[PDB]
Each structure stands twice: as C-alpha cells, then as structure tokens.
Amino acid sequence: SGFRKMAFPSGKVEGCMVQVTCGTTTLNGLWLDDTVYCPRHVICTAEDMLNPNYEDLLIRKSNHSFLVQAGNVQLRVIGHSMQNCLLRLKVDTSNPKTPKYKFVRIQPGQTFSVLACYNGSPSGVYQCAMRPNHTIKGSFLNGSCGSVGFNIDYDCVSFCYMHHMELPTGVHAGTDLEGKFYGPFVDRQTAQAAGTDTTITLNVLAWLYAAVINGDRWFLNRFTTTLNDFNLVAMKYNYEPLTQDHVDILGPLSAQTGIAVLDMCAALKELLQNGMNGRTILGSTILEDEFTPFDVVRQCSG
Amino acid sequence: FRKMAFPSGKVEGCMVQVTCGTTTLNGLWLDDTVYCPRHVICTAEDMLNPNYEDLLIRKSNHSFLVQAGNVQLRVIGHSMQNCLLRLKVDTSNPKTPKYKFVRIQPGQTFSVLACYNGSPSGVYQCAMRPNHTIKGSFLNGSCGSVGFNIDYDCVSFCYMHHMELPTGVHAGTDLEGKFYGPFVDRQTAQAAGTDTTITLNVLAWLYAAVINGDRWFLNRFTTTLNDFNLVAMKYNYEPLTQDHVDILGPLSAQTGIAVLDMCAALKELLQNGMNGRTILGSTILEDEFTPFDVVRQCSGV
Ligand SMILES: */C(=C\C(=O)OCC)[C@H](C[C@@H]1CCNC1=O)NC(=O)[C@@H](NC(=O)[C@@H](NC(=O)OC(C)(C)C)C(C)C)c1ccccc1
Ligand SMILES: */C(=C\C(=O)OCC)[C@H](C[C@@H]1CCNC1=O)NC(=O)[C@@H](NC(=O)[C@@H](NC(=O)OC(C)(C)C)C(C)C)c1ccccc1
C-alpha cells in the first residue's frame, strides 16, 4: 500500500565513500577492497577542463599526487591507472566495509539509488532512473562528483553509475563503474546537448499497474489497443516506443491485477490524450515513469 | 530537485528482526535496548483490541527472539512503553550511532528506512502530514520500520511504523511509543482526518526554487497572512501562521523575499495555476520540503 519513490538502503555504499583530492580538486570516490574509483577529471586543472588530455594530464601525476581520504584518515594511494573516464587508485588498506559488489552498466529506463556525496561524505540518497537520453534527472551540486549510482540485490551492491557532469539542461551525466559514460558525453566542459528525452513507457505502465495493485482503478477503460496503435499515440506524446519485450516484462504485473498489458496501454493512451481530468493517480498529477516494473513488483507484492 | 533521504547507513545498523511467537517485525536496536511495536506480542486472535498490558505480562524474555544477521540477541529484559516494547538485550549494539528520540511535528519531514524481517529494504523521504499520518509505502512485515532525521552525525529517531489507515496512509508513534495523531495500535475503525497542503513547506519549496533560479512566479506585490489564508483555505492549504513565517526566515533572508511576498506569489500560483509552467521541474506545488530541508539540498550538507 502507499507508493514512494523508494531508494535502496545506502548503508553499504556509504562505507565505500571517500574523498579523493588531486591538486586543488576534490570529489568523491568509491573504495572497494584496495581500490578507489573516481572521475578521472579530478586530475583536471581548472583551465584544463576546456579540452583536457587525460593520458597526458595523468602521466604527469603520481601515486602521491592523489589525496584519498577515508573519513578523516588519509588513505595511502600506492598505484593508479585510468580506465576510460575513471581513475582506479590502488591503496594500501582494504576497506573492511566493502560490501559484496558487482559493477553493472544499466540500461536506459532502469532505476537505481544515488548516494549524493560531498567530500567523500554521504549527504543524501534518492532513487532515480537512467533517463532515456542517458542523463539522470537528479539533485547534484558542485562537489557531488564521484557520487555513485547503485542497486542492491539482497546484499550484493550493483554499482551502475558514477557522477561526472551537469548538462546545461539541468540534468546530470555520469559513467558506469568502468568509466564509460552513459549517453554521448565526455569528460570535457564543451557544449553537450542532453539528448532528446522521452518518457519511459515501460515504467509508466509499471506505475499504473502499481496504482491498480494498490486499489486505484479509475484510469482503466474497456478500450484496448494494438501495440502499434498505442505507440502511434505514445510517440506523439513523446513516450519511448513500447516493444513486445516491454509487455513481456509487464507480464507478472499483468497477471497480478489481471489486466492485459495492451489494455493498460489502452488506459495509458486515454490518459495521455484526455489528461488526468486534474485527478490524480497514486498521488501524482502526472504519469510517473521512474519506477521500473521490477521496482513496482518489489514495492507492492511483499 | 528530488526528495532526498538521509543516508540510511546509521539506522541500517540499528535494524533488527523481532520475533514473538508467530509475529515477526523490525526492531530498532539502540544500545542494550531493542524498540519495536508492542503489537509484536499479538496474532490473529488478539488484534481487534488486544490488552497489551495483560498480553505482555504473560510473555517472558524467552518469548522474544531479537535477531541481527545470523546472530540472536538474548533478550534479558522487557517492558512496554506506551505502544512500544523496550527489550533489554544482553548486547549493546556496536553500530549504535549518536541518537535522539524526537517527536516530529506535523509538516516536518524525515527519512523512513522501510524494513522487513529485520532487514532494511528501501529508504524514502516523507512528511508527517497535517492529519498526522504519512504518505509512506509499507507492506506487511514493515512494522518497526523507523523514520529519522540526521543532524550532523546524530540520528533523530522520530518515527516507528505501526498502523496503515484504510486511506492507504500510515500511522506510527515516536520512539516513546506515543502515537502521532488520534490513532491507536488496534484493529478499530479509525480514519485519518482529511489532509491539507503543508503551506509552510510549499513556501519553503518556492524559496528553494528562487534559490535555484526559478523565480518566474514571484510578483511585485505582497499580501497579509490573513488574506493569504483566505485563498489557501480554498485550495485546502494549512493556514500559514506567524510561527510558520518565522520558520521561513532563513530562506526569506537568503533570497530577501518576505514570506508574505512569497505568499502573494503562491496566492497567484494557486488562483492561476502554473499555466504549463514548472517550478523546480515539478508541475505541482511540493509540500514535503520543510524550510530546513530546502537548506540541506541547496546548501550542501
Ligand atoms: C562534479 C565536480 C566535483 O565534484 O568537483 C569538485 C571540485 C560536477 C557536478 C555538477 C555540479 C552541478 N551539478 C552537477 O551535476 N562536476 C562538474 O562541475 C562538471 N561540470 C559540468 O558538467 C558542466 N558541464 C558542461 O559545461 O557541459 C556543457 C554545458 C558545455 C554541455 C556544467 C557545470 C555546466 C565537471 C566537468 C568536467 C570536469 C569536472 C567537473
Ligand atoms: C506492521 C505489522 C507487522 O510488522 O506485522 C508483522 C507480522 C503493519 C504494517 C501495515 C502493513 C501494510 N501497511 C502497513 O502500514 N502492522 C499491521 O498490519 C497493522 N495493521 C493495520 O494497521 C490495519 N489497520 C486497520 O485495520 O485500521 C482500520 C482499517 C480498522 C482503521 C491495516 C493493515 C488495514 C496492525 C494490526 C494490528 C495490530 C497492530 C498493527
């Protein structure tokens, strides 16, 4: 019952947040075992951000060029390397609080928790989704960089995102724990259109099923709609095209609630076209798409 | 600008599973004490209206099974404090963070670490609604889940989950076992009073917008706290009081926009809607960001 944009317990991720400083640049880092990840752009001098040559800027650095700090104790960096847009600083001590973890490049539309950090210190956690344009509509300020995006599968933390940029659109862009950006962005402060955004159709349906699982039903109709017709409409409303895989995914949620995916699609279509009569769905006044089908099934069943 | 929750690390280390017979729920393990809903000592038979006092006096420490991981905390004492059970355990939680028990006030917010069988499952931010309930997300077995605020390094435990009003909302108690609202921890037929918009927070929010550069809604005029309330009344807004105004002060000072001025702005935001316009991204007027919260996210904490 009830429905919140729920984030995973950030506890296990906090125990891996550290401060990493190079020159006068300081940002967050992930310290797992004997390694610390952070946006390689930490080595970027001010003026060096217009068009930095990381390979060049890094070679001019050394282990001691990095001031990695765990809380208030200085971590000794005894090895460093670059992996795409990351810095993999090896340290001498191994973080005893390193949770069971895995690095995963999430798929646009998927959701994850973000531990907003500043100076290697957890400031807040929020759940967000990998927007369709690969950016993340988040709340980040200067110094949030190095914050990690993660998921928790029981006790195994899946790091999927590491903050890096701030597209002018006000959104945010980062990398996966392997340094590869999400979207067509780069470690440069150079014009970067935060690509055409779309509404995650998959999630809005998952969300609508959630509202239904929770008793709300007013938006349903006797109408139905082919996958193709739903798309012809949805796309007009700037919605991600809905694929058969998506409806397969909504399968479970379809069963429970007993509503056929396209029927729900028929409801979504109506909503899009008739607006919400001012009325609300599961609280919101606008179709929510930051809850994946998996999220919903996890927050409604048990 | 998203609704952020305090990192739940500290509370996570204080969540334990409390079992009593067939009833299992979450327990807050601070020091040598484990707090959990007193209805942990219930079951299908004694719920409509259990006599806890009696029901507990029939239970002994061996009745309770407090667990943390694959560890079992021998319970060496048990007392009931209002609607909570204070369970003394033979072990003082090593992860106990500096903590206070503070009874939150309507409108104020806090993070909620939703738990299941002693395990933290998810953490979200919410507000203690005017009607005294919370638009949270809880499923069976979430009981004992705690709400909290973090002041520097101190955890301010302000909420513990117990009931779920038919409204789809939730009632709980502070960590002293006293319920927030008229609600009780019984299967009565209690209903949440109608809710209102936390005017104070909407305001705080608008300010936050102004702080981030979203000020299209401001206006040249002002209004009287009285005149504003006549509007707010229509849109079912909490009547703004001078105490509310003073609470906004910092935000008001930072942006130099007088509360009554911002109300004037909110007045027209209510009477003319946002005409397709968005404040801080949203299309609706957020009322779950207290003045203090607005600071947190904007003035990094
Ligand atoms: C994190 C940097 C950090 O922690 O530094 C501490 C000293 C950010 C966070 C960014 C701040 C506000 N919200 C955010 O998400 N890192 C940056 O400031 C980066 N800045 C940008 O992304 C800029 N992007 C940009 O110029 O792109 C175009 C507008 C040209 C398309 C923003 C601020 C305009 C950053 C980039 C590169 C290196 C270091 C930092
Ligand atoms: C936590 C109990 C727990 O941990 O039990 C583990 C076995 C809840 C959480 C509740 C679950 C779903 N969302 C929630 O908020 N404890 C209860 O189930 C309690 N149930 C209620 O509060 C019921 N309220 C109720 O009937 O109120 C009226 C409709 C009569 C006004 C809900 C579920 C309808 C609960 C029941 C009995 C004693 C103590 C708590």
Residue numbers in the entry:
A (entry chain B): 1 to 302
B (entry chain A): 3 to 303
Paper text:
CoV main proteases (Mpros), which are key enzymes in viral gene expression and replication, were revealed to share a highly conservative substrate-recognition pocket by comparison of four crystal structures and a homology model representing all three genetic clusters of the genus Coronavirus. Superposition of the structures and model revealed that all these proteases have a His–Cys catalytic dyad with relatively conserved orientations, in which His acts as a proton acceptor and Cys undergoes nucleophilic attack on the carbonyl carbon of the substrate. The substrate-binding pockets located in a cleft between domains I and II, and especially the S4, S2, and S1 are highly conserved among CoV Mpros suggesting the possibility for wide-spectrum inhibitor design targeting this region in the Mpros of all CoVs.
Thus, by combining the modifications above, a novel compound designated as I2 was designed and a series of analogs was synthesized for the inhibition assay (see Protocol S1). We were able to solve a 2.7-Å resolution crystal structure of SARS-CoV Mpro complexed with I2 despite the weak noncovalent binding, in order to enhance the inhibitory effect of these compounds. Briefly, compound I2 binds to the shallow cleft formed by a portion of the strand eII and a segment of the loop linking domains II and III. The Cβ atom of the Michael acceptor forms a covalent bond with Sγ of 145-Cys as expected. However, the failure of P2 and P4 to be properly accommodated by their corresponding subsites attracted our attention, and might account for the poor inhibitory effect of this series of molecules. First, although phenyl at P2 could enter the S2 site, its rigidity prevents it from reorienting to insert further into this site. Based on the complex structure of I2, we entered into a second round of optimization focusing on the P2 and P4 recognition sites. For the P2 subsite, the phenyl group was substituted by a more flexible Leu side chain.
